[PDB]
């Protein structure tokens, strides 16, 4: 299985919250906020 190239995932539970970013989006403008721009 592989995640959708265009969708960023937020998930929250008892341990708190994480965001996970497709490696297809790192190196785009969308990666910059995660510290992984062009």
């Amino acid at each position: 299985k592989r995640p959708d190239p265009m969708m960023i995932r937020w998930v929250n539970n008892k341990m708190g919250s994480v965001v996970a970013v497709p490696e297809e989006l790192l190196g785009t403008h969308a990666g910059v906020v995660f510290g992984a721009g062009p």
Partner: protein, 441 residues
């Protein structure tokens, strides 16, 4: 706040015999009118009769509004009670006929029954996927009771609601799957500390129990006018509240009348006929009356209750005078209830009721004087002096309204009769009907 009819809390009649009590539920006297009104409540509550026009007639004061307001308090919440001032029918948006049609149809309710499913549970996990630079959204909600756990797909509309509500793990939420409303109810455990800006702390709740889903019957009452508005439009249901509805076409209403009958036979809807109270009906014009003649003939007509102060008076839009200001072919359709001016023993009771409602402690001498003032100047004037005298008494730090406080109120504020004298005694210094006046001393 206290208003003119706040003390009126019913019609004051024996529910068995319909006998009016001499005092009850804030109403005093008018026993024949109160008995006649009690019969009309039965016609309303039974609902079988359509389109009976009742006119309450009497001189000013005498409780014509008070009786009609007593009826509203007796019908309770489920029944429509549309109150029109006749001056509201004149409009720039719509014709008078259209304004009357809407007010008639506001007075017929439609009690729809629907069954809904609500979820309730502790949120264990929430997951949302968002497109970069786009609207596409999907997600999953993991939600729990002490006895079930399940994972539900969320659509875009749910995700919008979920983030508007800031749903987080540990929140207790309920979701009505029919409306899509989400409400939070509390938390199963403290709000986690690692993140900042996490919002206000909630109520605590223990986890919900039993099944996640349950079915729930819900009942909604809407007027036929609301259904008219919703179905005359694709878009713009804000017009239901804004006015702005235009002149709805009659072939739409024909369809709605059929469908409501169909909904009734199917048991989808219960029709609930209420009343249109038109106050000061002598303000309608001759075209309005000609419309009402035939609006009453529908089997969807409400019972129409009317009030008039008028003697033999000119009909509006008309050359000629008629009783009550109403035309005769209209009065042929109308039964009249007459109110009568009060006895001093009735004024004393009414003023006592107003004083109790306003929380004013009259001395017996103040009440006697107010009763005497009530005979000479009218019930409304004497009721205004109650509030005024209370204030004046308070400024001198008296415990109770004395005769001295009522006398000062009478001194300060002119009786409607004394003001007419004052107008006569200064005819040159007030502006005349021909505009002449003198300003010099």
């Amino acid at each position: 706040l206290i208003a003119a009819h706040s003390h009126i809390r019913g019609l004051g009649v024996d529910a068995d015999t319909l006998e009016p009590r001499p005092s009850s539920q804030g109403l005093v006297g008018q026993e024949k009118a109160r008995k006649a009104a009690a019969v009309v409540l039965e016609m309303i509550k039974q609902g079988k009769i359509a389109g009976r026009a009742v006119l309450i007639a009497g001189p000013p004061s005498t409780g014509k509004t008070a009786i009609a307001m007593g009826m509203a308090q007796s019908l309770g919440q489920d029944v429509p009670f549309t109150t029109l001032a006749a001056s509201e029918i004149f409009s720039l948006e719509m014709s008078k006929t259209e304004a009357l049609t809407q007010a008639f149809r506001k007075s017929i309710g439609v009690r729809i029954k629907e069954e809904s499913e609500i979820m309730e549970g502790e949120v264990v996990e929430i997951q949302i996927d968002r497109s970069v630079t786009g609207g596409a959204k999907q997600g999953k909600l993991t939600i729990k009771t002490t006895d079930m756990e399940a994972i539900y797909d969320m659509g875009s509309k749910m995700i919008d609601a979920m983030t508007k509500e800031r749903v987080m793990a540990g929140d207790i939420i309920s979701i009505d799957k029919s409306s899509g409303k989400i409400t939070k109810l509390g938390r199963s455990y403290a709000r986690s500390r690692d993140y900042d800006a996490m919002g206000v702390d909630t109520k605590f709740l223990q986890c919900p129990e039993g099944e996640l889903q349950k079915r729930k019957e819900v009942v909604h009452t809407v007027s036929l006018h609301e259904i008219d508005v919703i179905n005359s439009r694709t878009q713009g249901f804000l017009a239901l509240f804004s006015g702005d509805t235009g002149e709805i076409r009659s072939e739409i209403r024909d369809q709605i009348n059929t469908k409501v009958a169909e909904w009734k036979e199917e048991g989808k809807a219960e029709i609930v006929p209420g009343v249109l109270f038109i106050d000061e009906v002598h303000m309608l014009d001759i075209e309005c009356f000609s419309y009402i003649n035939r609006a009453l003939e529908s089997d969807l007509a409400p019972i129409v209750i009317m009030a008039s102060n008028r003697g033999v008076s000119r009909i509006r839009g008309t050359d000629y005078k008629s009783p009550h200001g109403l035309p005769l072919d209209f009065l042929d359709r109308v039964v009249i209830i007459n109110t009568h001016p009060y006895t001093p023993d009735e004024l004393r009771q009414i003023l006592s009721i107003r004083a109790q409602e306003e929380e004013v402690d009259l001395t017996p001498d103040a009440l006697a004087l107010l009763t005497k003032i009530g005979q000479e100047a009218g019930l409304r004037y004497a009721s205004n002096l109650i509030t005024t005298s209370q204030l004046i008494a308070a400024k001198r730090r008296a415990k109770q309204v004395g005769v001295e406080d009522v006398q000062r109120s009478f001194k300060l504020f002119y009786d409607p009769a004394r003001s007419v004298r004052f107008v006569q005694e200064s005819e040159k210094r007030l502006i005349g009907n021909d505009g002449v006046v003198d300003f010099s001393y």
